Amino acid sequence: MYDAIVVGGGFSGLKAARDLTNAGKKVLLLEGGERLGGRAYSRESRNVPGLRVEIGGAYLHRKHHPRLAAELDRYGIPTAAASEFTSFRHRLGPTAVDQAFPIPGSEAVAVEAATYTLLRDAHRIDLEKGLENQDLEDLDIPLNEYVDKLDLPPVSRQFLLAWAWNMLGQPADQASALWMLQLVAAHHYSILGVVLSLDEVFSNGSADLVDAMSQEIPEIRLQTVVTGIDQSGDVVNVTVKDGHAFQAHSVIVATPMNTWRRIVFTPALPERRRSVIEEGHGGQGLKILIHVRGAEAGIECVGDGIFPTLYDYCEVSESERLLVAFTDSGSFDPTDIGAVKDAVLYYLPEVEVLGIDYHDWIADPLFEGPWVAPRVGQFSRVHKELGEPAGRIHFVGSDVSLEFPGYIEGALETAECAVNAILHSHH
Amino acid sequence: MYDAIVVGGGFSGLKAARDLTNAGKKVLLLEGGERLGGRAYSRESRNVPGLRVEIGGAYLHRKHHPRLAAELDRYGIPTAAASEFTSFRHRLGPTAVDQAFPIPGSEAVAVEAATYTLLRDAHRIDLEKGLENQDLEDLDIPLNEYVDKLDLPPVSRQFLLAWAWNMLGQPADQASALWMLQLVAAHHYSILGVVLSLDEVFSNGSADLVDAMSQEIPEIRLQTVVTGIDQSGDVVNVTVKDGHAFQAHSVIVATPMNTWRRIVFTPALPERRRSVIEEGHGGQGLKILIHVRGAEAGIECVGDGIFPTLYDYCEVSESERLLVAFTDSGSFDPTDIGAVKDAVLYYLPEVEVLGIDYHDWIADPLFEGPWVAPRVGQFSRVHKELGEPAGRIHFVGSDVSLEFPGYIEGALETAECAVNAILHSHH
Ligand SMILES: Cc1cc2nc3c(=O)[nH]c(=O)nc-3n(C[C@H](O)[C@H](O)[C@H](O)COP(=O)(O)OP(=O)(O)OC[C@H]3O[C@@H](n4cnc5c(N)ncnc54)[C@H](O)[C@@H]3O)c2cc1C
Numbered sequence: 001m002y003d004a005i006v007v008g009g010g011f012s013g014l015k016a017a018r019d020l021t022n023a024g025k026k027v028l029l030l031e032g033g034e035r036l037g038g039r040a041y042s043r044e045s046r047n048v049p050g051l052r053v054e055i056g057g058a059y060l061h062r063k064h065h066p067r068l069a070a071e072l073d074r075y076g077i078p079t080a081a082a083s084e085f086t087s088f089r090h091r092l093g094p095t096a097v098d099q100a101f102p103i104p105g106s107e108a109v110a111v112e113a114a115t116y117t118l119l120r121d122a123h124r125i126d127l128e129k130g131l132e133n134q135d136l137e138d139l140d141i142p143l144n145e146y147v148d149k150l151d152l153p154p155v156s157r158q159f160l161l162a163w164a165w166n167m168l169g170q171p172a173d174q175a176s177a178l179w180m181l182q183l184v185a186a187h188h189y190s191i192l193g194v195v196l197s198l199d200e201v202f203s204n205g206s207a208d209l210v211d212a213m214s215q216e217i218p219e220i221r222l223q224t225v226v227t228g229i230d231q232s233g234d235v236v237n238v239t240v241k242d243g244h245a246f247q248a249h250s251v252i253v254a255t256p257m258n259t260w261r262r263i264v265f266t267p268a269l270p271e272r273r274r275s276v277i278e279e280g281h282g283g284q285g286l287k288i289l290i291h292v293r294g295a296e297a298g299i300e301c302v303g304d305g306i307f308p309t310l311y312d313y314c315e316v317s318e319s320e321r322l323l324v325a326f327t328d329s330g331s332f333d334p335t336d337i338g339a340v341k342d343a344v345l346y347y348l349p350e351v352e353v354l355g356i357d358y359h360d361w362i363a364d365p366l367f368e369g370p371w372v373a374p375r376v377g378q379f380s381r382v383h384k385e386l387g388e389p390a391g392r393i394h395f396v397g398s399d400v401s402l403e404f405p406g407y408i409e410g411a412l413e414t415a416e417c418a419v420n421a422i423l424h425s426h427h
Numbered sequence: 428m429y430d431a432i433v434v435g436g437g438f439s440g441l442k443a444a445r446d447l448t449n450a451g452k453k454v455l456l457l458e459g460g461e462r463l464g465g466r467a468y469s470r471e472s473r474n475v476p477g478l479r480v481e482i483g484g485a486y487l488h489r490k491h492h493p494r495l496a497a498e499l500d501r502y503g504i505p506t507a508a509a510s511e512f513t514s515f516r517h518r519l520g521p522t523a524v525d526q527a528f529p530i531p532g533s534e535a536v537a538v539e540a541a542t543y544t545l546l547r548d549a550h551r552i553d554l555e556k557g558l559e560n561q562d563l564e565d566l567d568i569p570l571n572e573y574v575d576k577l578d579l580p581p582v583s584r585q586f587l588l589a590w591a592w593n594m595l596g597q598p599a600d601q602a603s604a605l606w607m608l609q610l611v612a613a614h615h616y617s618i619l620g621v622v623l624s625l626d627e628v629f630s631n632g633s634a635d636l637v638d639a640m641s642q643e644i645p646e647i648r649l650q651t652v653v654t655g656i657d658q659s660g661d662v663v664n665v666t667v668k669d670g671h672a673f674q675a676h677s678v679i680v681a682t683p684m685n686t687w688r689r690i691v692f693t694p695a696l697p698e699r700r701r702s703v704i705e706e707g708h709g710g711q712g713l714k715i716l717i718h719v720r721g722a723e724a725g726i727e728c729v730g731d732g733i734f735p736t737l738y739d740y741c742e743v744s745e746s747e748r749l750l751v752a753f754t755d756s757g758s759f760d761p762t763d764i765g766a767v768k769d770a771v772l773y774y775l776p777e778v779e780v781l782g783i784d785y786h787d788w789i790a791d792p793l794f795e796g797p798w799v800a801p802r803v804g805q806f807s808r809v810h811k812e813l814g815e816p817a818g819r820i821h822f823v824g825s826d827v828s829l830e831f832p833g834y835i836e837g838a839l840e841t842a843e844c845a846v847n848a849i850l851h852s853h854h
Pocket residue numbers: 007008009010011012013030031032033035036037038039040055056057058059060224225226227254255256259263285286287361365366367369370371372396397398399406407408409411
């Protein structure tokens with residue numbers, strides 16, 4: 001039997017397993033898939049042989065992501081500046097300026113005011129308390145409604161909404177304003193930081209870090225899907241799909257929130273958590289890598305398109321590139337290449353689409369979603385609780401971070417808390 | 428005898444006198460100088476024959492200055508756009524961008540944060556209550572100290588301080604932060620609005636409006652300096668320098684605050700007011716018109732010079748212009764033409780200074796100062812009170828406006844209040 005079983009080998013599970021191991025605990029890591037890294041997933045391009053791409057998480061900022069920065073330094077993992085944007089092709093209307101910050105002077109005063117309002121509202125959020133524990137309900141309303149209250153002129157309005165669509169992976173009428181503001185808060189109470197934290201990337205892919213961490217974890221089982229976690233007895237029994245059971249004093253659930261509903265917990269999880277876990281979060285983010293010809297280097301596009309954003313990803317040749325688009329899978333069907341062409345051409349009418357590459361995270365039974373974003377009304381009811389222990393079962397992951405949810409950094413942060421919890425546990 | 432004597436024929440006195448007259452009151456306006464208009468003073472250029480310039484107040488914005496806008500509409504007074512700025516020659520360091528808003532991206536996050544802080548602080552101010560009545564003392568500290576707390580990087584820091592020097596007519600160590608914030612508040616809680624309200628000018632000079640208003644005032648005495656105001660009796664006695672006395676039921680003091688200390692009030696003014704009135708406010712603003720050769724049209728300069736700002740005023744010929752510089756008379760001696768040349772050349776090394784034109788408001792016994800700005804510590808002690816009646820003597824003027832102090836608009840606003848007060852008076 002083990003001191004701890006860690007379920008899921010994303011960055012959260014990987015950190016927990018590693019750190020517990022180095023603390024002298026006897027750990028088993030169970031991973032359901034054929035690979036480690038989870039929603040961090042570097043692989044060969046489907047479109048361009050020999051070219052390595054990120055199909056999930058990719059971007060970081062040392063200043064905002066200190067835990068991640070520490071991991072990089074720890075293993076000597078090379079990073080690079082994200083591609084500088086030098087050509088701006090927005091669709092924000094005729095008054096927009098083609099720069100990274102496209103707001104014209106005529107809108108300045110409006111933006112000044114909105115900046116105050118947004119930051120004032122964001123400053124209502126204490127990152128330690130949970131979004132359900134702070135009388136924040138008035139903010140937990142559809143983003144479009146909140147933004148309507150800001151009364152923004154057209155450039156700023158559409159610029160805000162575009163990036164919010166990108167960042168939350170939800171259309172404006174499904175996103176929670178409270179959550180937008182959570183993201184602002186996470187970035188040291190900065191709206192600009194939400195986009196400025198797309199700062200650096202893994203020179204050799206996220207798998208570089210994944211592999212470094214896993215080398216420190218002595219016992220890992222791949223292709224092992226946990227189906228039950230039972231703490232009715234003295235020792236936790238973890239049952240597995242086509243497998244013998246495993247047993248441990250403590251269990252760390254480091255699988256995506258939207259998958260928890262597939263595990264049988266005994267006894268049942270605390271009742272306040274149940275409804276949200278059943279429903280899942282509302283995240284529908286969709287990251288599409290687009291192989292193109294005829295695009296100059298360094299393009300950024302933001303506007304009112306079905307792709308709110310479309311921007312440079314990498315040089316393929318002197319004529320070819322990858323761009324990246326963000327949209328959401330409720331709004332957009334990436335199997336419709338005609339739709340992709342239209343979406344691209346809206347911004348870049350000279351460019352030819354050669355192919356696309358993405359992973360349907362929401363259809364993947366090991367995930368059932370991309371990165372976290374709550375449905376309106378969810379997280380002002382229950383949030384901190386989702387990430388709190390139920391007896392000997394801890395719950396970690398980017399999904400449940402109070403501090404940096406939806407980022408690699410949140411994965412690391414949550415793991416830390418669980419590790420500490422366990423090391424300081426009396427049982 | 429009169430219903431009302433108005434003392435001073437600036438815009439405040441002019442409005443009060445006119446409006447009381449039209450209400451059927453019998454009014455006398457006493458003006459100490461040889462002209463009406465006060466710190467609004469259009470005249471022929473000392474440098475360029477035949478060219479009319481503003482030697483005091485000049486700039487307005489209809490949106491921020493509705494009373495003034497109403498006066499303009501009332502008399503069909505033509506206005507024009509202030510000269511558009513199209514060439515930026517700042518001295519804000521090597522990272523600055525040469526545009527109206529010179530802040531580089533590297534400073535954006537700093538400016539975001541400062542915007543919140545500034546507006547948060549400004550929003551502490553209720554414009555109706557007076558600066559002494561709101562527990563605002565913690566803000567009434569030297570501007571340099573306040574700004575040090577914002578921790579701004581060099582471009583934004585110096586840009587802020589430059590415009591603040593311009594606007595307050597005080598160096599950073601003499602200006603009150605609370606007052607900066609008052610100005611922000613007045614402009615509907617906008618920092619950007621403080622400079623954006625330099626929007627339009629009088630096509631034919633401020634004297635256009637001055638003359639329009641005065642045509643409606645039936646009795647005016649020029650060259651009549653009031654030396655005493657005595658309300659010990661049933662009827663107010665107003666004594667005059669070399670003149671018979673005049674008498675009225677009510678008296679409106681519409682002279683500059685820094686001159687009140689020269690009048691004998693009987694009985695003495697309420698004791699809380701006395702110290703500030705004796706000291707005067709700390710305003711040292713200095714507006715210099717600079718006749719130049721070799722300057723292209725549309726220049727704006729902001730930076731760390733002894734002229735914080737230097738900008739286009741008017742075309743004189745194809746080779747010649749007027750620029751305008753703002754500084755303060757404690758820091759700068761405009762009789763030192765060498766100093767002027769150095770100050771200009773710092774920004775504009777190619778330009779030749781031909782001559783200058785200004786009025787020494789602070790040396791003018793009818794004024795003893797330019798526009799209002801408090802010394803640190805003054806207005807958190809006493810402010811609203813300065814503008815309140817003492818028995819039958821009312822106190823008006825731009826200097827004492829709660830709503831738009833230091834602007835023509837404040838002159839008009841204060842007059843309104845006094846007029847209303849008098850019309851609704853029971854006595
Ligand atoms: C398209 C996309 C783009 C992103 N972009 C960025 C970005 O640029 N920067 C950034 O910081 N973050 C980004 N992220 C968010 C970030 O990648 C994720 O939040 C993060 O990697 C999650 O780590 P985790 O350890 O919480 O969960 P995951 O990485 O999801 O790990 C969960 C593990 O659980 C395994 N599992 C599931 N069910 C079972 C079961 N029953 N039994 C056993 N194992 C199971 C899964 O196979 C998986 O390996 C992105 C995410 C997506 C999807």
